[PDB]
């Protein structure tokens, strides 16, 4: 009832499992990256147009739109670098050298203030991703590491990050199952708590920013009160195919497995509904307070392979859901809110 | 596109912080007084050079002396509203304390230009105790904080205070 489905288009220029798929801040562009290192920046309004295409020689692991300077895409490599890419010039601006011995740039967050980004730099894998890592605030226009955050008790691989609206707060999820909330000028975490028995895969502030959501390897979707140090507000057990591991199998004995690496859950413009992954397509839940189960209010379908990452772009009261799957296909479902 | 601002209202107990907030959002007032217990908020949509701002306005217990709230609450803030009662000079002499306590807990990088507004509330009542010039001078000394004399009872200058912190935060 709340959403009218107007159509579903397919972007098919990737030929490998998608790793990231994110709409820019304007809503007009998508950046998507597959496991074979191919980046596509493309439009869908008014036509599905591949605005740019790169093939990275080195592995790429994370992707993040700039907020102030939209048309800038940040790309975290597997060789300790962060690339700033100009999506309107179709051109690398620079490659910032982050860290020598911790090369997996697992997560990137651009500050809304436009000057800095936080990134996650993890040691190589091999429970394979409970290895150490760094969380660094990098100041782009000074070109130096402004701050390193203390990851108590031991350094740990940070999977996922998200800024609050003014850029003073960063919520993070680590391989050890802990949420850590950091003040952007205290190197000590302002707050941390055990959140999942397993890795935290995605984190996000609620719309009003008085709670944070996490999705974890233990299969649970939990809302936490950040005014009372991660007091569980609500808890839900999502379907098994919302957190994977995501597996594409064939008649040839050849199987692909992918652990959550990308965006696992996405929200409409004010946080009433949540897109998630499934084996057949995106599943949209309402987020009202039944508190025992989430009501599945819409299902997008359209995929022959498991969906591993999602995104939800809102403006116009005209939402736009992206669902990306292991066959490399990206489906774009347009909704109208009522 | 939507923009969130969190607005903190600070000041001594009884200066009219709840009354001012309810007058801004609900547009109504109650002569009955009941002390605010922790911190809690109301939200309203306003707009600024044709851009819609979701303004989350927070009420703080004045008796609580801004102390044991969250970093999540302190660092989430984008505007500070300092309120005193013009018919009560002690509520004015505590302004330096409330502003210092905000700057310590909220810790803005650029305090000089942080969006502050100072409200001398309750000018509907006669028998002012705080001279206008003296409040003007105090607000000026802190690098020209915008100063308003207000009445939540008669809805005088509430819109101006909120618009001012909204515009200056959106910069
Ligand atoms: N005449 C007049 N009375 C006011 C005005 N504003 C508030 N009052 C009265 O002053 C009393 C204090 O009001 P509140 O708004 O609850 O004060 P508060 O700042 O919220 O106090 P705490 O919650 O304890 O920190 C109330 O009884 C109001 O009716 C005003 O502008 N004019
Ligand atoms: Mg009050």
UniProtKB/Swiss-Prot annotation, chain A:
Keywords: Coiled coil, Endosome, Membrane, Phosphoprotein, Repeat, WD repeat. GO terms for molecular function: phosphatidylinositol 3-kinase inhibitor activity; phosphatidylinositol 3-kinase regulator activity. It comes from Homo sapiens (Human). This is WD repeat-containing protein 91. Interacts with WDR81; involved in early to late endosome cargo transport. Interacts with BECN1; negatively regulates the PI3 kinase/PI3K activity associated with endosomal membranes. GO terms for biological process: early endosome to late endosome transport; negative regulation of phosphatidylinositol 3-kinase/protein kinase B signal transduction; regulation of protein catabolic process. Functions as a negative regulator of the PI3 kinase/PI3K activity associated with endosomal membranes via BECN1, a core subunit of the PI3K complex. By modifying the phosphatidylinositol 3-phosphate/PtdInsP3 content of endosomal membranes may regulate endosome fusion, recycling, sorting and early to late endosome transport. It is for instance, required for the delivery of cargos like BST2/tetherin from early to late endosome and thereby participates indirectly to their degradation by the lysosome. May play a role in meiosis. Its main location: membrane. The chain holds residues 394 to 745 of 747 of the full protein. WD repeats lie at residues 13-52, 55-95, 122-148, 153-192, 195-234, 257-295, 302-338. Belongs to the WD repeat WDR91 family. It is found in: Early endosome membrane; Late endosome membrane. GO terms for cellular component: cytosol; early endosome membrane; endosome membrane; late endosome membrane.
Curated annotation (Swiss-Prot), chain B:
Phosphorylated at Ser-68 by LRRK1; phosphorylation is dependent on protein kinase C (PKC) activation of LRRK1. Prenylated. Prenylation is required for association with cellular membranes. Its EC number is 3.6.5.2. A motif (Switch 2) lies at residues 63-78. One of its GO terms (cellular component) is melanosome membrane. Keywords: Acetylation, Autophagy, Charcot-Marie-Tooth disease, Cytoplasmic vesicle, Disease variant, Endosome, GTP-binding, Host-virus interaction, Hydrolase, Isopeptide bond, Lipid degradation, Lipid droplet, Lipid metabolism, Lipoprotein, Lysosome, Membrane, Methylation, Mitochondrion, Neurodegeneration, Neuropathy, Nucleotide-binding, Phosphoprotein, Prenylation, Protein transport, Transport, Ubl conjugation. Mg(2+) binds at residues 18, 36, 59. GTP binds at residues 13-19, 30-31, 33, 36, 62, 121-122, 124, 152-153. A motif (Switch 1) lies at residues 24-37. Regulated by guanine nucleotide exchange factors (GEFs) which promote the exchange of bound GDP for free GTP. Regulated by GTPase activating proteins (GAPs) which increase the GTP hydrolysis activity. Inhibited by GDP dissociation inhibitors (GDIs). GO terms for biological process: autophagosome assembly; bone resorption; early endosome to late endosome transport; endocytosis; endosome to lysosome transport; endosome to plasma membrane protein transport; epidermal growth factor catabolic process; establishment of vesicle localization. Disulfide bonds: none annotated. Its main location: membrane. GO terms for molecular function: G protein activity; GDP binding; GTP binding; GTPase activity; retromer complex binding; small GTPase binding. It is a peripheral membrane protein. It comes from the Eukaryota. It is found in: Cytoplasmic vesicle, Phagosome membrane; Late endosome membrane; Lysosome membrane; Melanosome membrane. The modification Phosphoserine is found at residue 68. Widely expressed; high expression found in skeletal muscle. Belongs to the small GTPase superfamily. Rab family. Switch I, switch II and the interswitch regions are characteristic of Rab GTPases and mediate the interactions with Rab downstream effectors. The switch regions undergo conformational changes upon nucleotide binding which drive interaction with specific sets of effector proteins, with most effectors only binding to GTP-bound Rab. The small GTPases Rab are key regulators of intracellular membrane trafficking, from the formation of transport vesicles to their fusion with membranes. Rabs cycle between an inactive GDP-bound form and an active GTP-bound form that is able to recruit to membranes different sets of downstream effectors directly responsible for vesicle formation, movement, tethering and fusion. In its active state, RAB7A binds to a variety of effector proteins playing a key role in the regulation of endo-lysosomal trafficking. This is Ras-related protein Rab-7a. It comes from Homo sapiens. The gene is RAB7A. The chain holds residues 5 to 175 of 207 of the full protein.
């Amino acid at each position: 009832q709340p959403f009218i489905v107007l159509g579903q288009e397919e972007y098919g220029e990737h030929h490998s499992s998608i790793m990231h798929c994110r709409v820019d801040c304007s809503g007009r562009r998508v950046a998507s990256l597959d496991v074979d290192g191919v980046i596509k920046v493309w439009s869908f309004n008014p036509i599905m147009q591949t605005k740019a295409s790169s093939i990275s020689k080195s592995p790429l692991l994370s992707l993040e739109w700039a907020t102030k300077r939209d048309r800038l895409l940040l790309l975290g490599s597997g060789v300790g670098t962060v690339r700033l890419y100009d999506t309107e010039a179709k051109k690398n601006l620079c490659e910032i050298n982050i860290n020598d011995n911790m090369p997996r740039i697992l997560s990137l967050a651009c500050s809304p203030n436009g000057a800095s980004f936080v990134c996650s730099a993890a040691a190589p894998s091999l429970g394979m991703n409970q290895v150490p890592g760094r969380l660094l605030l990098w100041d782009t226009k000074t070109m130096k590491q402004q701050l390193q955050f203390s990851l108590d008790p031991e350094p740990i691989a940070i999977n996922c990050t998200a800024f609050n609206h003014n850029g003073n707060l960063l919520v993070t999820g680590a391989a050890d199952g802990v949420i850590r909330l950091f003040d952007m000028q205290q190197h000590e975490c302002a707050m941390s708590w055990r959140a999942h028995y397993g890795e935290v895969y995605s984190v996000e502030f609620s719309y009003d920013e008085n709670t944070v959501y996490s999705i974890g390897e233990d299969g649970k979707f939990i809302q936490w009160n950040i005014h009372k140090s991660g007091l569980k507000v609500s808890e839900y057990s999502l379907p098994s195919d919302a957190t994977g591991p995501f597996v594409l199998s064939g008649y040839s004995g050849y199987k692909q497995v992918q652990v959550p690496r990308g965006r696992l859950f996405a929200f409409d413009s004010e946080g009433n509904y949540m897109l998630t992954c499934s084996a057949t397509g995106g599943v949209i839940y309402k987020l009202g307070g039944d508190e025992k189960v989430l009501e599945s209010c819409l299902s997008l379908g359209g995929h022959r392979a498991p969906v591993v990452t999602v995104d939800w772009s809102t403006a116009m009261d005209c939402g736009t859901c992206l669902t990306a799957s292991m066959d490399g296909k990206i489906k774009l479902t347009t909704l109208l809110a009522h | 596109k939507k923009v969130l601002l969190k607005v903190i209202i600070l000041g001594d107990s009884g200066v009219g912080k709840t009354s001012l907030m309810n007058q801004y959002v609900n547009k109504k007032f109650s002569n009955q007084y009941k002390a605010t217990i922790g911190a809690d908020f109301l939200t309203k949509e306003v707009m600024v050079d044709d851009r819609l701002v979701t303004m989350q306005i927070w009420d703080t217990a004045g008796l609580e002396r801004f102390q044991s709230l969250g970093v999540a609450f302190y660092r989430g803030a984008d505007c500070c509203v300092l309120v005193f009662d013009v018919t009560a000079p002690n509520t004015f002499k505590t302004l330096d304390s409330w502003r210092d306590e905000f700057l310590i807990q909220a810790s803005p990088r650029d305090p000089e230009n942080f969006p502050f507004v100072v409200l001398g509330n309750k000018i509907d009542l006669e028998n002012r105790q705080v001279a206008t010039k003296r409040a003007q001078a105090w607000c000026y000394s802190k690098n020209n904080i915008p100063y308003f004399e207000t009445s939540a009872k008669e809805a005088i200058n509430v819109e101006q205070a909120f618009q001012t912190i909204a515009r200056n935060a959106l910069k």
